[PDB]
Amino acid sequence: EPEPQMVLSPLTSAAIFLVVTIDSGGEDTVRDLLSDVASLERAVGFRAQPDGRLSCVTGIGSEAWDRLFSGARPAGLHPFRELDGPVHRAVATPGDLLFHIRASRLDLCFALATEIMGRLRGAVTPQDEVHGFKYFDERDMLGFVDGTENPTGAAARRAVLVGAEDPAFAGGSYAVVQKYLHDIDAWEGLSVEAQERVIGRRKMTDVELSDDVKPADSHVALTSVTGPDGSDLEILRDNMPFGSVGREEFGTYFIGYARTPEVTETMLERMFLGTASAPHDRILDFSTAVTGSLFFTPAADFLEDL
Amino acid sequence: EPEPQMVLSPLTSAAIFLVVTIDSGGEDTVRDLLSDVASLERAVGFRAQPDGRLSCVTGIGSEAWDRLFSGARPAGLHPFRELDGPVHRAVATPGDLLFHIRASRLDLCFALATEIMGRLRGAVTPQDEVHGFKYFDERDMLGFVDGTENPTGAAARRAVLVGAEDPAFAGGSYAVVQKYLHDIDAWEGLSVEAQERVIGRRKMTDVELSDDVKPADSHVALTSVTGPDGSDLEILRDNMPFGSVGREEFGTYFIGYARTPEVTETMLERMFLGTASAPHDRILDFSTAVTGSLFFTPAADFLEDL
Amino acid sequence: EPEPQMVLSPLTSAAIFLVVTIDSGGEDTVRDLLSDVASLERAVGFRAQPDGRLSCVTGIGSEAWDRLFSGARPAGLHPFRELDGPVHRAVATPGDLLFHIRASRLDLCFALATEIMGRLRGAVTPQDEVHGFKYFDERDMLGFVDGTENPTGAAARRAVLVGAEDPAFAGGSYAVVQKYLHDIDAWEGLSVEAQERVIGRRKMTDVELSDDVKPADSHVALTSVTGPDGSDLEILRDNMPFGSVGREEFGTYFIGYARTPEVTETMLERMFLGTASAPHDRILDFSTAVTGSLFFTPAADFLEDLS
Amino acid sequence: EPEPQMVLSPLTSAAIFLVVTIDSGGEDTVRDLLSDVASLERAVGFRAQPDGRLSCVTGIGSEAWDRLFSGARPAGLHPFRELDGPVHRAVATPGDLLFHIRASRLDLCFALATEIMGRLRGAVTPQDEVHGFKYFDERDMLGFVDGTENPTGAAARRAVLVGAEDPAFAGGSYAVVQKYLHDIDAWEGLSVEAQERVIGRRKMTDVELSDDVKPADSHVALTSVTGPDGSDLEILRDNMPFGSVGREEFGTYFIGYARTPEVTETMLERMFLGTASAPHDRILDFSTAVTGSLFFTPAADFLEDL
Amino acid sequence: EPEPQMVLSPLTSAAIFLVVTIDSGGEDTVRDLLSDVASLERAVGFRAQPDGRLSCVTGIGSEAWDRLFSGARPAGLHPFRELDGPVHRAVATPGDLLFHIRASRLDLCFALATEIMGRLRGAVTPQDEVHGFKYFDERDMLGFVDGTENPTGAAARRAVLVGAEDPAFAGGSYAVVQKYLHDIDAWEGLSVEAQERVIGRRKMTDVELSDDVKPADSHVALTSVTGPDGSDLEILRDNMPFGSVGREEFGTYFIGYARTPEVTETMLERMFLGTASAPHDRILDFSTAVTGSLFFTPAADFLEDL
Amino acid sequence: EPEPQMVLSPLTSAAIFLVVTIDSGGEDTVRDLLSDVASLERAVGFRAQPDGRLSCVTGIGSEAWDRLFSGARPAGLHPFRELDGPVHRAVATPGDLLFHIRASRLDLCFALATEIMGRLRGAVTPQDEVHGFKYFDERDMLGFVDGTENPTGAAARRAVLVGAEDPAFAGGSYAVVQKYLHDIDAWEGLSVEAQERVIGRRKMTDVELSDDVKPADSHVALTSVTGPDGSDLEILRDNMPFGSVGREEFGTYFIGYARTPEVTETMLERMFLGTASAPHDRILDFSTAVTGSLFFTPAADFLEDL
């Protein structure tokens, strides 16, 4: 019955990520923006309804939920954990509102972001405004196909949508965002076989490496987590490449939706802290998480009732 | 006989404007890059040939030409003139190499720019990188359709391509680049009729205003320059919007190609210094020029012979 | 009977509205066509099936229903009410059968209409035939974006499809059709701010005006109807621009699908008769309704299995 | 060289034909419009530049040419000849101005026609306008593929544009406009083989019938005129299906461009009056001409220089 | 609840049919491929996600089911019946594994087939490989529109998906595959009306012939089977044209999905053996069946759990 | 003045290569087909001409020219020269007529080939028929991008169209066709760096290797022929991947157009016989030539005058 936000939509060719902090006394402005965001998205996106698939997902951080709403907090909504392994660390950056805008053209995303920021001209403060674009075969900046094993259909619904465990917030999701900056020089220093061993998949054919050859510290092996029931826990992640050529900045904005934050937290702990058979993820040797945050994206019905 | 660059192409949806300055001792690397920029463009763009429309235009500033080539300089190639008008001024900023990359997708432009700057590591210091996107209705940040009256066909090449006036540099062109930052807050405070009077075109229908009603200080009226023999002086403009909603940065990157810089300089003088019947252009009351430069784009044959 | 006649399909770029009336003795061939309309639509559309998205919706008027079928009538399905306000009027032109054809290309719609009328030749009288096309940003003849606030997903299904209130006719809908001829000269005589105040949304960015500034007599304000339980009533509408510049004729064909006709009747009454705080809709000052009719679009299986 | 109009354009999905008669005293309005038709077309069609492919062609009748322009007349521009055949006839209807608008979507053509008629309010009387649409395989309403043997490339330029025979009007063309109402019942009453014999080509594969079995009175055979020197005489046709289902009106709007009207006049005479081996064209047994006119489409610079 | 193998996917423009026979001792490799086929399809098809629509359907023959799996068998699974009609005979050919690959481009299908065969190298013998391409308007080699009356929506699910009748194998389907070679010259010898009477539909308009004129031995009149309870028995068919001009070979590869094989068996018996009012199907006079097999396509969950 | 036979057309997604041998006494039928091939191509293509891009190129072998035409012969026409290298051989196969059909869909190519072969039924013997498909990323079966360095525009016209050196046959070209079978099993055993060194270009980004480190026996370094006057000899080649997974056949059909066969013969001699610094091309260690022929594709007007 509850209507989830557009989190199950397929990834498009253009996206904008807005991580924004809320200034003191701007709670009412944020409330009315959350009420009107669906109408704003519809108005901006209907001008190109046949093609463009404009979709805005709004999430609220743990530190802002108790300041905006006086009801019951969603279960598991907590500030992003600080993971500091022996070598790499995951830093948590301030963030209260997440606006994830996706469309086939950057113009629609820019217009929607402009409208949203205009409605919040003097009540908030931007933190991590980022534009992201796709490549030829949906590749990332590391040259590998990204998001191949994303759950689809009913599997995605079971993986990312909150069910009867939190009846008051059915249809919501937990989104973990993390901006990484790559080291392209070191990555290009390695051979293609070394890159495949680091990732765990073939670079050209995208065929997953055989289990008897896949290294224990590869990114794919460490992110493959199986729960107590024997089924593999999965999340609907949508990485977006980004960067500026002049500043020699290349990176990836990872966003991951789940029905509970525990799956993403376990994946991050395995990647950073490492398992018994692997000190840490190999992909972290060439990628540093410059920012990280956690948000809760509620159902559209909850947002429309403010 | 000479082969001009891709300066005569339809305005694509995505573009990257790179302006860089050559450091000391980097002339040899710049020459090496210019000797194979066409090959790099072909290699990057052939991967998506039918849908993609990748095209890179390379231009050399007046300062860089003396230190790069020992031959005769192109006629009219001079450092960008700075106009100190009574109210507005056109600032001239350093720049020695311009790469104007255009494609239907931002990924191709980003890959080409990455390859170029990787070839130019250490040799040049980046000065201005702009990622321009084109709206669904190829409108400006002011909401007006841009490039409607661009010359096309034989008129375009007769207006932008150097002919027999400079036989040694036939097929080249002069490109004036200028970055404008718009004051959207003040622009939105004007009625649609006021905006149309400022621009000189109808906002929705894009129909030019009548001669008896068009204001003398409108942008279209001031940029319409008649030649000494009754002909109309024309330039090719590929200005595109750009900006980021995080910093309240909304702007337009203007690039203009001509046979000689005299036409563009006259248009700029009319816009900034004004006319006897108009103190200055009205569009400058809402746009501020923060970067201006002039470059010469030679024929592909000239670049391939280095 | 869960089988709607594709009335939830998104708006396409080309459409044909065909309202006809059946003369005496034509009740037999019309029945034969109604059992073949789906097959004809499939046969015409499958050629362009990858992107043709051809869809035909058939509706039966109040008189035509009890003229053709001898079963129980659907709840409602009254002849279209004629509203005669202090200034504007809503005429109720005769109409028995409505064919709403939608496709990305006009050729598919024209072929389907040609086949339908060839099967119907000699037994119907064409009351109205309108070819509608879509502008750039789904604009209407007034220059505003049309259909922005259309319900989508499960909300549209709950808003247009008949539920358990009429179990015998589940999956159907009630379609109200009207033809408006705009006064383009008067509309262009107004400033853009005046046009936005008349409509209720910004012309450029399609963002609707704030509550404290939106006029009480604007079209959007008057068509925003709140139900007795606080839930706003919604309908699915596909307004198609049409006209010919030779006759200086410009207009919009409005079609509205609802679960019950009462919602559309209330919206029309508020637009024409007006409320206490607004004499009538402002958009009616530049639009004149030349036709008007109400039809019931039954479920696909009901048309296939006549009774 | 003179710049030709948009006559040399490919067949397009949507078209509008607008034939009007200039009222008394409305010469000045038409004259000032003709200098603005190119600007109006550019303004309207630029909004959909990548795919709109909007193009407007303007033609002037003989009486309209006499009333408007006081210069020399083109070699053609005689009032459309009315052929009184033994069975069929080609009526000549009044017409002074022809606007042929072509675009991929009918909205562009409608907007351009609206602009033109608004500029022509109170000065012209619309004789008739036709909204033409293309079927699946560019077919006509008779079920056959239309325009298969149209000239292309330099051959079309030689057979359409006016050359050195009339140097003062180089780049123009002569357009013959006719409106045919088909008898679909009689056409459908014929077998497919009979229809192919009527037309002269196979309906299925669209291949031409072999010359030993093609009937002498077939449409293809009769409109295959051989020049005095043995060179084939050809014209460019852009037939547009049209009709209204409610009125049971089905028909084709034929427009034919030539470098001289005599080619189209000879084709029409062969079709209607017939040859020695054929009383008349067979396709005329199912098509009735209800509107005929002849116009001259001048070069773009001629219209601009007014 | 169980997820099918996307047997309800819309018809695409390119397909590959691969029928192979498992060699002795190759059961383990076949099981591994059946486990990894979903991952292989996801990896190959993700490179072109928006377009392409790559989908692979895997079916196991009756002779191979008892060799690969143990414990239970589908109720309807059995070796394909051979029909020895008075004139036409439907031959049964050895087939153990069926791979039906569909995509908008043949390259994706070829890559998927290459991966599958490489995984199966040394374990299976390729009995048949067919590359089918969609014709002009979904026509077949006979020129008639193919697939017009396929069930869609919930009707297709009720017609092709196994329900509560076989709970252990819910979500599966039964696929009957045949390869017909056409006598194109003899078919073209017939008139268009004769062809329509043989098929039962209009050649151009695809309108079904009236019941008063439709021949009793036409293809449509013979494949229209009414159920015992007055319902209509329906199957999902994807007929793919194929052939080579060098060998003068043209044909259609027919695949039919059903919830039970009884419907397809009844249709084949009516087509070949014929009813009381028709000796056999008329289309069989111009088509010869050179291949026939029956396979069971289980739910994706069953294939994954191996 | 002469019209080229659509040789300069851009590469499409689907192609059909037909090589046939004229039987004794079938010269008249071949002449009739050569006369009617343009009409057949137009008739087949105009159904999908908005985006079909169908184009048929016809070439006549050296032996067939002496039989079909009794006039003068093109200077460069001669039977294909078989090269017997130390380890590799270029076999010459009997081929009299070449039909190279290109279109965005295999449907148009198959229809055109069917019509052509039907007109040639009983007159020619089909020696070879290849259905070539083009990968999603313009790659070949070796995983590298093909045709990156193909000449375009004026350079291509100068390089592939014969001019004043043979005025009687101006507008024609010489096409060399070869059928290659690849050893994918051995090719995949090499590292990506080894594959790049064999080819001579980067596999990922298609960037040509630097002048140093580039092997002297690489394919690119061996097909880069410098003319006597310091210019680079270039040909327009359209390699098409092809094969079947059932027979484990993978290969590339190479077709190369030139203004004279000397350039292609020199390239083949360098690849097979080898230079002083390279025994032979490395790519030949994984590709075997099973077919080789040379044809002369004349101008369209030459074929239309039969």
Ligand code: HEM
């Ligand atoms: C710079 C950071 C990252 C990059 C470039 C990256 C890229 C990739 C790539 C190329 C793959 C293989 C392709 C595919 O499976 O679709 C993959 C797999 C995956 N990654 Fe990431 N990833 C990053 C960070 C993360 C993080 C932070 C998480 C979780 C917290 C994550 C979770 C996963 C999962 C669940 C899979 C699929 C595992 C499987 O298929 O068994 N990734 N990633």
Ligand code: HEM
């Ligand atoms: C006569 C000419 C009409 C025109 C040009 C027109 C056009 C429009 C436009 C531009 C809007 C605002 C944009 C949008 O909501 O998508 C709108 C809103 C709407 N109109 Fe109309 N309309 C017309 C007549 C009608 C009629 C006759 C009805 C009902 C009987 C109706 C019902 C509505 C509704 C329900 C809305 C939604 C407003 C909201 O959800 O806040 N309109 N219409």
Ligand code: HEM
């Ligand atoms: C009145 C209804 C007409 C219809 C339905 C029609 C349609 C056709 C068709 C289907 C063809 C064969 C396919 C093709 O050539 O593309 C054709 C050929 C042709 N028609 Fe028409 N046409 C009509 C009138 C005319 C008129 C009035 C003229 C000239 C005054 C004309 C001139 C030609 C020419 C020149 C050809 C090509 C001849 C050739 O290829 O040798 N047609 N027409």
Ligand code: HEM
């Ligand atoms: C037999 C299998 C062949 C394959 C797979 C193949 C593929 C390639 C590839 C990948 C390239 C580099 C990328 C590109 O130029 O687009 C290339 C270059 C080239 N190849 Fe081939 N080729 C083959 C045979 C031939 C033959 C037989 C010839 C001539 C008789 C030839 C002539 C050329 C030429 C002229 C170039 C351009 C190199 C340059 O301009 O620097 N190739 N080929």
